[PDB]
Structures are given as C-alpha cells and as structure tokens.
Amino acid sequence: MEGWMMAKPSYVKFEVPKELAEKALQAVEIARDTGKIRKGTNETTKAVERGQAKLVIIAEDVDPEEIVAHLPPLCEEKEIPYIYVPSKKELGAAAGIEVAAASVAIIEPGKARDLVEEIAMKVRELMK
C-alpha cells in the first residue's frame, strides 16, 4: 500500500493532471473577471454550505492540513465539484489578490460556464 498519496497532503483525495489544474486556475480568473467567486476557506465553506458554489478549488500546499481538510468531505456531502491546484500562492493570484488563498469557490462562472462544466465532468471521472 504505497503510491502517490504518500507525497501529497491527506486532504488531497486524488491526482489532478497538470493541464486540468491549469484549467481550474483559468476558470477562477475568468469567473473573477466576468462572474463571481469567494476567496478563502471561510467564504468557500459558507458558499458550499449555502449551496452557492458551482466549483471548489483547493490548493495542495496548505499547512496545517486542518485549514482545508473539511472541504472535500463537505463538497461530496453537498454534491459540489472540487478540484485541486498545486500552489496556494498561484490560486491567490488567479483569484486577484496579493496573498495566497487556501481555497476558492466559483459562484457564477460567467464566461467560464463551459470550462467549469468540463472540469466538473472530468473530476467526476477522476473521483472514480
């Protein structure tokens, strides 16, 4: 019982292809520019709990793990798509802020409508 899970945080439930992680970041930027997003685990969690989130993006380098470890279980409970990206700094950047973001929620994709649906469908495959 070894593998990819050894090198990644325990809150990362699955491997995300590089290009797919790149699409998630682009969707965040597009949504930031033409739709509506929520930044940070606090807001992201609320959006998920309130059923507003269309997609949840979680950085893979957040420490301590408790900061976002509750997101994956909650998203699956609420049937809300979530995907991971390598850097919390980059996620912050995509979200339009100067500091890092542990997680982000896309409420209205705006022009990223189709991209978000693509991401959700692929992640759906992955989680299998």
UniProtKB/Swiss-Prot annotation:
One cellular component (GO) term of this entry: ribosome
Swiss-Prot/TrEMBL GO biological process terms: ribosome biogenesis; translation; tRNA 5'-leader removal
Family: Belongs to the eukaryotic ribosomal protein eL8 family.
Function: Multifunctional RNA-binding protein that recognizes the K-turn motif in ribosomal RNA, the RNA component of RNase P, box H/ACA, box C/D and box C'/D' sRNAs.
Entry's localization field: Cytoplasm
Gene for this chain: rpl7ae
Keyword Ribosomal protein in record: yes
Alphabetical list of InterPro entries matching this protein: eL8/uL1-like, Ribosomal_eL30-like_sf, Ribosomal_eL8-like_CS, Ribosomal_eL8/eL30/eS12/Gad45, Ribosomal_eL8/Nhp2, Ribosomal_eL8_arc
Origin: domain of life: Archaea
HAMAP family per the UniProt record, alphabetical: Ribosomal_eL8 (MF_00326)
GO molecular function: ribonuclease P activity; rRNA binding; structural constituent of ribosome
Assembly behavior: Part of the 50S ribosomal subunit. Probably part of the RNase P complex.
Keyword RNA-binding: yes
Alphabetical UniProt keywords: Cytoplasm, Ribonucleoprotein, Ribosomal protein, RNA-binding, rRNA-binding, tRNA processing
Pfam family, one: Ribosomal_L7Ae
Official protein name in the record: Large ribosomal subunit protein eL8
